[PDB]
Amino acid sequence: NAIRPTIGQQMETGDQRFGDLVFRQLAPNVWQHTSYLDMPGFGAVASNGLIVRDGGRVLVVDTAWTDDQTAQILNWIKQEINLPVALAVVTHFHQDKMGGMDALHAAGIATYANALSNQLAPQEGMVAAQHSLTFAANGWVEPATAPNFGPLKVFYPGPGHTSDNITVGIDGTDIAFGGCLIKDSKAKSLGNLGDADTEHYAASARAFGAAFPKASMIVMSHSAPDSRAAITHTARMADKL
């Protein structure tokens, strides 16, 4: 029953609450952040993202739902990590998370999103990220658009849950972030399909899996971390579309 520990990793089970936020350490330099919104007709809905420590800076993947919740993420980073946040990558446009963008911009943090996300946001009357990511034909981000991204490996799998959904692998870890594209293996549904691409969704989910074949831990926007079973389950459900 002895467990071999990993230096810099909190080994015990027990998430940390910090205000409205919950933090879980996934690897010595990676944490999941989780916030909740009470959506009418749905109840509480989770938003998860990542905080990645890379050398003398922090990189953020995705925001919380609101300005105040995203400010709390920044306050947690100040308290627990004490390194500047160099940049944030936002993996899709979400009409309910604009408050989050505001908090990052107010803090002077450079924001990056899929070029298509930066079209969709102002089409819905919301601010774009400061910078646009573009992608090679193979789906990998063009390095000219993503300078100094450190261990973040950004991949556009094709349209799925939304037309603009991108994903992010973390080099040096077994973690990949599927954004809003992937749901967990206990999901009863693919969720709200109002912006979904039914024709390509299954293929996009499989492309994500093929892009990060070494990832054994899958983190997602609206479900708890899971094994690769999340990718399989998501693709199977999307096959029914």
In sequence order, the 6+-apart residues with CB closer than 8 A to the CB of 163 are: 116, 120, 195, 197
Binding residues for Zn(2+): 92, 94, 96, 161, 180, 222
Contact between 123 and 96 under an 8 Å Cβ cutoff? The reply is: no
CB atoms within 10 A of CB 125: 8
Strand arrangement, sheet containing 152-155: 152-155, 167-170, 175-177, 217-219
What is the experimental method?
X-ray
Contact between 14 and 4 under an 8 Å Cβ cutoff? The reply is: no
Binding residues for substrate: 183, 192
Give the C-alpha separation, 168 to 162, whole Å: 16
229 phi and psi, to 5 degrees?
A: -55, -30
Give the C-alpha separation, 82 to 96, whole Å: 29
Amino acid at 189: S
Resolution of the experimental model, in Å, one decimal: 1.8
Contact between 170 and 151 under an 8 Å Cβ cutoff? The reply is: yes
Contact between 176 and 217 under an 8 Å Cβ cutoff? The reply is: yes
**SS3 of 38, please?**
strand
* Domain range annotation of the chain: 1-241
What tokens were used for 94?
């979400």
70-95 in b/e burial notation, b at 16+ Cβ within 10 A? bbbbbebbeeeeeeebbbbbbbbbbe
DSSP state of 186: T
| Helices and strands in the chain: count of H runs, count of E runs | 5, 12
DSSP state of 139: S
Give the C-alpha separation, 22 to 32, whole Å: 8
In sequence order, the 6+-apart residues with CB closer than 8 A to the CB of 157 are: 139, 165, 166, 167, 181, 204, 205, 207, 208, 211
Determine the topology of domain 1-241 in CATH. Answer: Metallo-beta-lactamase; Chain A (3.60.15)
Binding residues: 92, 94, 96, 161, 180, 183, 192, 222
Cα 32 to its chain centre, rounded Å, is 9
Q: Is the dihedral of CA 88, 93, 99, 101 positive or negative?
A: positive
Q: How far is CA 180 from CA 58, 69, 157, in A?
A: 22, 19, 12
Contact between 133 and 112 under an 8 Å Cβ cutoff? The reply is: yes
Give the C-alpha separation, 55 to 180, whole Å: 28
Facing residues of 169 across strands?
Answer: 153, 176
Using DSSP bridges, classify how beta strands 152-155 and 167-170 pair: parallel, antiparallel or unpaired: antiparallel
Closest to 126 (Cα-Cα) out of 73, 74, 67? 67
Give the C-alpha separation, 32 to 131, whole Å: 24
Give the C-alpha separation, 63 to 43, whole Å: 20
Give the C-alpha separation, 209 to 151, whole Å: 18
**SS3 of 67, please?**
helix
